[PDB]
Every structure is written in C-alpha cells, then in structure tokens.
Write a structure and sequence with these properties.
This protein is mostly helical and 486 residues long. 20% of the residues lie in helices and 1% in strands. The chain binds a RNA duplex (692 and 12 nucleotides) through helix 1 and helix 11. This is Group II intron-encoded protein LtrA.
Length: 486
RNA sequence: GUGCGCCCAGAUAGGGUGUUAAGUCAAGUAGUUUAAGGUACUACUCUGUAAGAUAACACAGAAAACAGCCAACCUAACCGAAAAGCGAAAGCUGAUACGGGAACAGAGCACGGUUGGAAAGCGAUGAGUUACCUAAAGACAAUCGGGUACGACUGAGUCGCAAUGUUAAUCAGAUAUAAGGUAUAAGUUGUGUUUACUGAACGCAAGUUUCUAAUUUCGGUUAUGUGUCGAUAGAGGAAAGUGUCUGAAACCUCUAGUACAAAGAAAGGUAAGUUAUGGUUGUGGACUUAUCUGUUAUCACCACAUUUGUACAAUCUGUAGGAGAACCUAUGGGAACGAAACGAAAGCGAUGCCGAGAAUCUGAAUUUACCAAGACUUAACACUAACUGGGGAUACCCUAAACAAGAAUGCCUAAAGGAGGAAAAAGGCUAUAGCACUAGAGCUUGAAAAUCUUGCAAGGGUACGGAGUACUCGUAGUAGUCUGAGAAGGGUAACGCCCUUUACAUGGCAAAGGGGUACAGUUAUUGUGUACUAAAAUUAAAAAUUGAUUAGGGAGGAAAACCUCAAACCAACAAUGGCAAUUUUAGACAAUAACAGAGCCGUAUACUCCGAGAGGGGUACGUACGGUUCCCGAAGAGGGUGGUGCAAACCAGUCACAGUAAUGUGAACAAGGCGGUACCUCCCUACUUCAC
RNA sequence: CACAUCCAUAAC
C-alpha cells in the first residue's frame, strides 16, 4: 500500500515545526490524517479511480505492483514525455493530460496527501481562483464585483509556469515543507522520471504522459507558494491609493494576473520593477512588452473573456464594477468551424454549417446541444444582456438548416412546433428550411432557454424534432419522447 | 445504381430547332393611299389620366392566333394484388375488374381532348378555445367602462398582388476597340493576405470590398418592437371620463417625438439598378432615383416623416497622446489613424469578343410619306437527341430430362426347394402430431414419380455512372477519302484545334458493358530492412568512473513540542564512452485484398431559364474524344459456404429384452444421421435505400 | 434599464 508517505508528512522532524505554516495550524492538523486512512488509502479497489467515468476495473491489487510496493518498483520507471496540449472551447486555459497507463493512475492516490496538506488552510480554491470554495466558476463572478474604486486593470502576456520552467525550483519548493531535514530520501526520486524527448536537454515538464492529472495539481502549488513572499509589498501598497479618490486586491489565475486598486500612474512604476525582480530571480524568465503595457484605460482588448469595464457591445458604467463580454472571443471559434459569415453584405447570418448531409438526425442536434450548454458555466452572468440575444439568432437557424439540407427538397414535409415559445403548437407546412418564425448569478441562464428548451419532452434541457423520436417506454403510461443520452 | 440513359446509321411510328417558296385568321367601328396590306394619318365611340375626389380637352391605348400557369373531370401508359399461359416455376408479359390518376423528374419523347377563369406562397384576417396595463398612488367591484390588430392559438372565410411572354419599321451615315460590363478557370497546402506549387497557361502587383456615418431628447438603448428613468413643457393631479374606499404636495400617462428658413413635402401603380446574398441561376416581397401631361373654377387647411445649408453646447464620442469617476492637447464628429472576414482574390493594364434607348449631329422624308414571318397548317432543304429501330460476350440463381458418377435386396424350411408360397424394411401416394431430421400406418411394393453434389442442352433477371496505361472474348460485315487522321507532317495551342497534300481497299473509329494476366497510387490486416558512408543533435540518459563538497533509513501503528514494537544503504545538480532508432547535412522496403466521382477550361454537337448583346449558373464531370490535379464511400437485409454453444423432439438391435423378420418398448444431450435458435464473419451479387 | 424577436417559394 501507500504507508510510506504516511510516516513522512506526519512526523516531518518537527522540533522546530516545519511544514507550512507553523503558527495557525495545530488543532486542524491531525484532521487530514483521519481522512487519509479510510478515504484515499483507499479500500483498496477495484472500485477506486479510473479514466472511464470514475470506477476502475478489477485487478489483483494492483495487479502485482502493489504487492511489492515498499521495495521501490520500478527503478527508475522511464516512460517518455511527448508534446501534448488540449485546447478548450472557452477560457484559454491549457489543461493537458497524457498517455493512458495503469501505472499513472497509481500515483494519483499519493499526490492527494500533498494537496490536502496545503489546501487547509494555506491553498485556496483548487484550479485557479482566489477565495476557497467547492467549484471553479464561483470565484470568477463574485470577487470581481467587490472592490475597484480606482478603476484600471492589468492584463497578461506570457504564461510563466508551463513554458519556461526552472526545474530545480519546481522541486526545490515542495520539499521545504514535506521533506524532512534528517532521514528523508524517498520523495523526489520519482518526480524526475518524466524526461521529455524533443532533441533537447531538459527534464520536467512538457506533456505530461508521466502524470496526466498530476500536472494541474502541482502547477497551482508552485505558483501560489511563490506569491506568499510577495504579500509583504502588495499589502503595504494599498495605503493612500484607495483613499485618494474616495470619498467622492490581487486575484490570481492560471496564466494571467490582475491588479486592483491602483492610481495613479506614478505609483504603477513599482509594478514593473518589484514584480520583475521576483520573476527574473525565481522563475528566471524575461517579461514580454514590460508586462503588460497599461493602456489606460477602457479599450476593447482581448483578455480571457471577462472585460472589466473601467453594437453588439454596450458601454455600461457607473459606481460599482460589472462585467461586459468582449467581441474578441466570438470572432475566432465561429470562423474556425464556419458557423456564421460576416461580410459579404448585410450583417450576421448562419448557414449551413458544414456539412450538408452527414450523420443521421439525432447526432446532428446533439452537437449543438453540447456546445451551447457549456456557455452557461462561463457566460452565466453579464451586464450586456442585449448581446446574448443577438447571438441566439445565429444558432436557432444553423441547427435547423443542417437538418433540412439532408432531405433537400425532393421528399415530403417536416413536423415541428414553436420553440420561442410554450408551446408546443403550430404545425408549419414547408419543404426546405423556414416557413414563418421557427444580475446575481444569474438571469443570463434564461437566454439558453429561449433557444431550444423542450419540444416537447422536458427532461433535462435538450430537444429534437417530432420526426426523429424513437418509440419506447419510460421503464400517463407512455409518451413519444426522445432517446439518446438517457 | 437518380425511370429511361452505351456505340454506330436516319428524319413525323412518335417530335423539335434554324433557313425559304406560300396559304389561312385577326386590327373597336368608317373613309383616303392601298390591300385578304396595316397601330402612320383624318372623323367618331369606349377605357386609363387619384404624379392631391370630379368636369371641359391633348397623349399613350381598343382584337385575334400561339407559347405558358391552374382548378374540377373520361380513359390508354406505369404498379402492391387479378385473370389467362409457359421446363408447373427461378421469373417475364397487362384487350379487362378493384385502386394514387397533368405519374413523384419534363430539362432531349409529347398522354390527349372539353368545361371553368382559378390554386400552393407572400401581405390584409372572418369564426372558436383564450392572455395584460387602464389616462389619476394602488387594490377591488368578470359593473361591454373601452374594448378585442401589438394578439397567443385551433383552423381558414373574404379582398389586392403571381391573372398575360410575344404582339415587327417614316431613311442612311459619323463621334464606333466612346464613356465599362461578361471572359482568361477548379482543386491541394504555407498563413502576419508572403506571392506557394504539379503536367499553374496567363502577368505586373500591393493591403481591397465593406461598416461605427445625420446630435440643443434615434439622451442612457440592436436589423424589429414594447415598456419606463433623468434634464424641461406641467395642463390633470384622494369624493376617478362606469362604482367605492384609503396615503405623500410628490410621480405616471400625454405634451415643444430640431431653434428655423427654402424647393418635393399623403394613399397606389408602371418602367430600370440594389435588396432575397453563405456554393449559384431564377420565379416573389420591402427601400432610394426617375416616371405616372397643359390650363380654368367651389377645391390647399394641417400638427409630421426627410435632404441641403447655418449656429452652438451637452449627452463624457473616435485615433495618437495625456490625465484626480466629476478631466487634459492636436485633429473635427474615421479627415487611412484601428479591427474582422478575405488565402493568383479585389484594382489596373495588354490581347480578344460584343453593339441598347439607333447618348449627341449632318442630309430628313413626301400621291399623309412605307413595312413581307407574331401564330397555325402544308411543301422542300441542312443538321441533332438518354426517343425509335439493329446488336447479347463476362459472373450467379433455379428447373426439366427413369441422361450419369458417388450406394442396389430385407427371410423361412434346412448349396437346394422357396418370400412367383404369408407378411413387414426400402421407395412411393394423402391427411397430420412436430422447428427440422425420422414418418405412425392402410395400400402399392421386395429397384419405381423429382432425396443431394455436378456436367451437357436450354432459358430468365442484372453488371448499358468518366478513375493513370498496355489487352484477351462478341469484331475490322450493319453506315468503311470520317466528326478521335490515316504516311510524312507547316506553324500555333498543355493535349485538342486549323490548313494543305493524299493510298480506291482486311489503311482508319479496328461499335459500347463487364473480367483476367503485369505494373505508377491509396486504405486496412499481417510481415519485414533494423549503419550502404562521414558528421551534428543525441532517444535508452537506468550502470562503473568522472567529488577529498551539503542533508539522507527500511517493515508498521499513534496528539504539536513525540511516544512504543520487530530488527552501512541510496539519490540529484552533470560529463565521457562504445552499442540499437530517427531527423538534418552529404555521396524505409514486400505479399495479399478492394477501387470511387464531386468538378472546371475548350472544340464539335442537343434542351431549359435570365439578359438588348459577350456569357454564367443546371440538365449522370449534360451525352463522346483529349488533357488534368484533387480524391481511395457507407448502412441494412436475403440466397450459399465455413467455424463454434445451449435447449427440446423423433426414428432402426445406435444399447438392452420378448420376437422369424420388420416392429413394440422403460431408456438418446452414455446423441448415428439432421435441423431450428443464438451467432462473430469469409466470399459473391444493383436484393432493397442513402452519398450525386 | 429592462423584456420579447421577422424574411418565403423554386432549382442541384
């Protein structure tokens, strides 16, 4: 099993208490050891962790490596590292994985002790964010609507954790709170096994086939720990700056950073000097365009997707700070898949998209319901409500045009209703496509309901056509409903 | 596998286009010239003149024959099923009855013939089931108070617009390579639109098209619409403009929806460009310009919707730059300062092609000036088609014929007489238990009527959609001095293409589909070279050595500062070194199996639509020929064959008993034959759809 | 500042 790590972080040769911290962690310290015995030990399965859903398959424990685990094995486990990066549809945050390997999943149970030992009470919010919660999007809508009296903002340029890696600092920082000063040598012997293969002398990391889920877990600890020594200058900087204008905050992410409470430009000279010496000494990487060239102030630039306001667009400002969606994130992902075409002439129009005749009938609508449902997790709160209504005009006609193009105009008619709507009535008689008219968290979720909500099953949020349902049963005995996901 | 769809001949079986000799009908009604001609002229009737109701009077216009859109209706063509025939069935063929009936594509084979004057759509909505404010601060009283075009919805009534295309002429010439719009392409991949390419045939070549565009209330606000906040214009402003009650001198509706001046400044319709645009043509509906005659008199009064010009400031309006949200320079509301989409695309230019009101003018013209195909019929000539008429190879399925190969007979008395004396297996003729195999059994019978595999003879259906070459069968006869050129070739063009010369006969297209034998080129399975040479980066980078350098243990359990038990090893920051791989610099390789079609340019030759023309977009890349990159298709369901389980049933001594034999029989998933089901697939084939 | 959304028929 994994009983070797349990006898390392508990003792730690505290005398002289090591770990982090050592002034406000005494009663809440043994609470982690109680969980690391019946939960992440684990059973051990069989039923533990796996790539398929969550529950793994059956093994001989597990199957033979866990039998002889205290005697290293393997030594030193090569496993090459190849270039791999997964791009998401929203929020430019590279979350790569790795080559699926049964040995890779055995390390996930060992790194959880490191994460739980820092998450309380030091590390806050797993995967970016600032305030500690239980999700990922709960710290991107409430924190931005708090402070912000001196307006302005700071964007980002390069990354600073994935590209230029100091290698030694990445390992030389975690051992300061886990590795013991005396009798400690079975920790960092398996972290240097991920030697990258790209005709260059480097090691860790650029993949990572050695650890798919292990990469996002260690990337947040290396970036948050280095900011602890920086707090001595940011807390002493917001003295006369917030009280200069009134009367009439440093949120971190994955690759970019923002700086709130500024003013004036004479005080911003220390931003490109105090923060530059910390990166050149620790991270050892030259900054790009001085980082990040203050535009001062309001300008439709590109930054993640939440343009902090300090047609289409709509300039809305006042006393508090809100969020306005910019137009740079909607002019890239659309043209790469040929969803809408600008000019041409007129303005915005769908068609078709590609291809004309493909798949069947249920597989076409599922693609549109899989790309529009995830927008609520990101663009679920925005002051520019009129912009979300214009974007729905390019999706209500694009999903239906692909269906009518499969049957062309040499067959019969189609059966549909009104999805505006409620509904569901109105049976139009058409052959081709078209006939007539086919704050807090918050209210932006209703925008997705006006598109395709239920026609007319009402079960989860998707809807198809009356000429594509499969006759089946539930197990008001039966009802002609859809059957694809459940 | 989009009905037919290939190649080579022709000219009403059934039909179309173009060029002529001719005939017939029509011009609202007369006259003149004149003619079975014709919108010119004169008189007259009627209609349009609402570019703002109507009258008087000048211009544009009056029919008919066709093409073509549609509704209601006979039957032949096509089909799931008739009937009647055929090796009695693998399948084909409709003089009929019952059924969609311009057949679902008419755009290259017409369906035809009457009546009727109208249908789908796009704007206006008649009837029903039914949703929200109320001019006043709110609620209630369904008090038709006020309704019910902001309608949702069931389902369609009644009016405009698809409901006319064509309907030709008083002459000629000049500004005529005029003012500027179709050609001169597809497709693949480099990507900051950089000039990237093969067997590009076209270049030069940089930033183009286009929108945020009008400010003393399109102020804070979309391509549309509704509602309410602030600056001001405050008449109403708790006994409500139906009925009643209860709180603030402050918030709702409405109103100065530009300070103003000058010329159009209202409902429709017609004739040309943009709008409907995603990859294109085109039939419909909304906005600009222009048009929808002169003149007299009751008829023009009016708050608006816009353009141009002028003045000023705010709503914190753009770029560079600057700056305490309540600001600060230049510029003046994109003054090329940003951004997105565009990947030899926009502009420009050479060459080539085309000629509309005959822009603008010179001679006009003259018995009121002089024009010969709009439509139908008939005759003749040139030319063409997926139509008609000839022609039937390579692979499968099924059946007939006591043709044949792979097998001929069961007992008793005891080799012979005898089952020619008695009867039962085996075969065959019915019903039927049963999934099949096997029949129980009367009779026939003790070699007979199709048990199977397969050959010969013969027949039906289908492969009658282009992939790079070289060919074997049906073949140089049915179109043979051709439309792919015969021999040599002149020039140009990528191959085609054009011109000239020319053998009177197996010179040439040697008429298509579909296979096989070798080989570029791709997908998939398996297999294979794994220093043929030097060098660079090195993947394995784990090991020994390169260090006299910092901190290091190897089973488990338990609070923080630790407490109990059993009892030297090793790592990193890195270097060198041969060994096996790849890339760069330099002198991956086989076998086997299958092969598909979205286009584009141009010659020759057939239809439809748009435009006055160059042409483009479709019709199987339109059907051939030639060139040519891009690009290696799928699902479902039968007829065969092969591999591999479970369950159930029957029949012979397959096992046992009685018995002359056949049979009976507890007992066959201790299975001999055989089949259903489950069932991953191989192979073959338009079996039926989809990708065009 | 807030809520609801408008373009068909036909030919591959």
């Amino acid at each position: 099993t994994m009983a070797i790590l349990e006898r390392i972080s508990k003792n730690s040769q505290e005398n002289i208490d090591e770990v982090f911290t050592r002034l406000y962690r005494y009663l809440l310290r043994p609470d982690i050891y109680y969980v690391a015995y019946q939960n992440l030990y684990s059973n051990k399965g069989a039923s533990t962790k796996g790539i398929l859903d969550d529950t793994a398959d059956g093994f001989s424990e597990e199957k033979i490596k866990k039998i002889i685990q205290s005697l290293k094995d393997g030594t030193y486990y090569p496993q090459p590292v190849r270039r791999m990066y997964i791009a998401k549809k929203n929020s430019k945050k590279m979350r790569p994985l790795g080559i699926p390997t049964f040995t890779d999943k055995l390390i996930q149970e060992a790194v959880r002790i490191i994460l739980e030992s820092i998450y309380e009470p030091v590390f806050e919010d797993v995967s970016h964010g600032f305030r500690p919660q239980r999700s990922c999007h709960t710290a991107l809508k409430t924190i931005k609507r708090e402070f912000g009296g001196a307006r302005w903002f700071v964007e980002g340029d390069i990354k600073g954790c994935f590209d230029n890696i100091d290698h030694v600092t990445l390992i030389g920082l975690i051992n300061l709170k886990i590795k013991d000063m005396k009798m400690s040598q079975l920790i960092y012997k398996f972290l240097k096994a991920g030697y990258l293969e790209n005709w260059q002398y480097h090691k860790t990391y650029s993949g990572t086939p050695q650890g798919g889920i292990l990469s996002p877990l260690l990337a947040n600890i290396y970036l948050h720990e280095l900011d602890k020594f920086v707090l001595q200058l940011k807390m002493k900087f917001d003295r006369e700056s917030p009280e200069r204008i009134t009367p009439e905050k440093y949120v971190r992410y994955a690759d970019d950073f923002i700086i709130s409470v500024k003013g004036s430009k004479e005080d911003c000279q220390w931003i490109k000097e105090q923060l530059k010496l910390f990166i050149h000494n620790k991270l050892k990487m030259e900054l790009s365009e001085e980082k990040t060239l203050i535009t001062h102030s309001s300008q439709p630039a590109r930054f993640l997707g939440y343009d902090i306001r300090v047609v289409k667009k709509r300039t809305l400002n006042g006393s508090v700070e809100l969020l306005i969606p910019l137009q740079d994130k909607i002019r890239q992902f659309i043209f790469d898949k040929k969803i809408a075409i600008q000019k041409k002439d007129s303005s915005w129009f769908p068609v078709h998209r590609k291809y004309l005749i493909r798949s069947t009938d249920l597989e076409i609508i599922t693609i549109y319901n899989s790309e529009l449902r995830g927008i609520c997790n990101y663009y679920g709160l925005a002051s520019n409500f009129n912009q979300l209504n214009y974007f729905a005009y390019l999706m209500e006609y694009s999903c239906l045009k692909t269906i009518a193009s499969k049957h062309k105009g040499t067959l019969s008619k189609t059966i549909s209703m009104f999805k505006d709507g409620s509904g569901s009535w109105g049976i139009p008689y058409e052959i081709k496509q078209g006939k007539q008219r086919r704050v807090l968290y918050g209210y932006a979720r209703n925008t997705l309901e006006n598109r395709l909500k239920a026609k007319c099953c009402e079960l989860c949020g998707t809807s198809d056509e009356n000429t594509s349902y499969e006759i089946h049963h539930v197990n008001r005995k039966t009802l002609v409903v859809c059957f694809h996901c459940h």
